Scaffold this active site. Structure first.
Site, PDB file in Angstrom:
ATOM      1  N   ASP A 193      -2.028  -5.195   0.857  1.00 53.34           N
ATOM      2  CA  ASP A 193      -1.426  -4.060   1.558  1.00 53.34           C
ATOM      3  C   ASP A 193      -0.023  -4.351   2.062  1.00 53.34           C
ATOM      4  OD1 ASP A 193      -4.581  -3.014   3.088  1.00 53.34           O
ATOM      5  OD2 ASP A 193      -3.621  -2.520   1.164  1.00 53.34           O
TER       6      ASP A 193
ATOM      7  N   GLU B 185       0.834  -1.191   0.000  1.00 57.63           N
ATOM      8  CA  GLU B 185       0.000   0.000   0.000  1.00 57.63           C
ATOM      9  C   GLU B 185       0.874   1.249   0.000  1.00 57.63           C
ATOM     10  OE1 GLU B 185      -3.063   0.393  -0.546  1.00 57.63           O
ATOM     11  OE2 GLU B 185      -3.297   2.503  -0.001  1.00 57.63           O
TER      12      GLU B 185
ATOM     13  N   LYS C  93     -15.356  -8.214   1.998  1.00 58.48           N
ATOM     14  CA  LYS C  93     -13.959  -8.279   1.575  1.00 58.48           C
ATOM     15  C   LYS C  93     -13.525  -9.711   1.296  1.00 58.48           C
TER      16      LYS C  93
END
Ligand SMILES: O=C(NCCc1ccccc1)c1nc([C@@H]2CCCN2C(=O)c2c(Cl)cccc2Cl)[nH]c(=O)c1O
Ligand SMILES: [Mn+2]
Ligand SMILES: [Mn+2]
Length: 180
Positions: free
Chosen positions: A93, A65, A119
């Site tokens: 991430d 990320e 998710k």
């Protein structure tokens, strides 16, 4: 048009996070001056990701990320092509060098499991580890495996609740919570 939320974001997060959030928003063609709640959420997600990677040992995490889309996938391919781990469908991430898995960290204003389930199916990637934080001190991680020790996660929850109080103190919390 100049919003209170944009001015709050700029004085609440450090400049390196705000710059990364802006570059991320325009890279996908969005305006921090207009879509200001999203601006606030991207800054928050970035800070939590950085606080998270600070929780481990020195070399424990590779940070995905906060990069350009091209170099982020480049690092993902290098990690996969050297650990054999499966290539996730969507950008994670972090990569955990200790547990040998990618992590997608989430921050939500809903119940952590409403957010985790969505998710979970959106990724559908069986390998990628999921870790969700809420603005009400809750968390929820894949396999109840929370990766970091308690103190590092507690640091993250404290900061999230301080952000929420700062927004609430400025009457921006309601618009922020309803906009997710
Ligand atoms: O990497 C991410 N997007 C790459 C493009 C990402 N995107 C979100 C969500 C959906 C997209 C925007 N977004 C936020 O506003 C935060 N959530 C995450 O947790 C996350 O990792
Ligand atoms: Mn991400
Ligand atoms: Mn994430």
């Amino acid at each position: 048009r100049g919003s209170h939320m944009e001015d709050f974001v700029r004085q609440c997060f450090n400049p390196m996070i705000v710059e990364l959030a802006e570059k991320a928003m325009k890279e996908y063609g969005e305006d921090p001056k207009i879509e200001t709640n999203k601006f606030a959420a991207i800054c928050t997600h970035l800070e939590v990701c950085f606080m998270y990677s600070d929780g481990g040992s020195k070399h424990r995490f590779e940070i995905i990320e906060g990069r350009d889309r091209i170099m982020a996938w480049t690092v993902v391919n290098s990690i996969c092509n050297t650990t054999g781990v499966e290539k996730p469908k969507f950008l994670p991430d972090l990569y955990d060098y200790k547990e040998n898995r990618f992590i997608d960290i989430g921050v939500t204003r809903r119940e952590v499991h409403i957010y985790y389930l969505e998710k979970a199916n959106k990724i559908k990637s069986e390998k990628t580890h999921i870790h969700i934080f809420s603005f009400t001190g809750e968390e929820m991680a894949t396999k109840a495996d929370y990766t970091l020790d308690e103190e590092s996660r507690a640091r993250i929850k404290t900061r999230l609740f301080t952000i929420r109080q700062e927004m609430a103190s400025r009457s921006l919390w309601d618009s922020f919570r309803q906009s997710e």
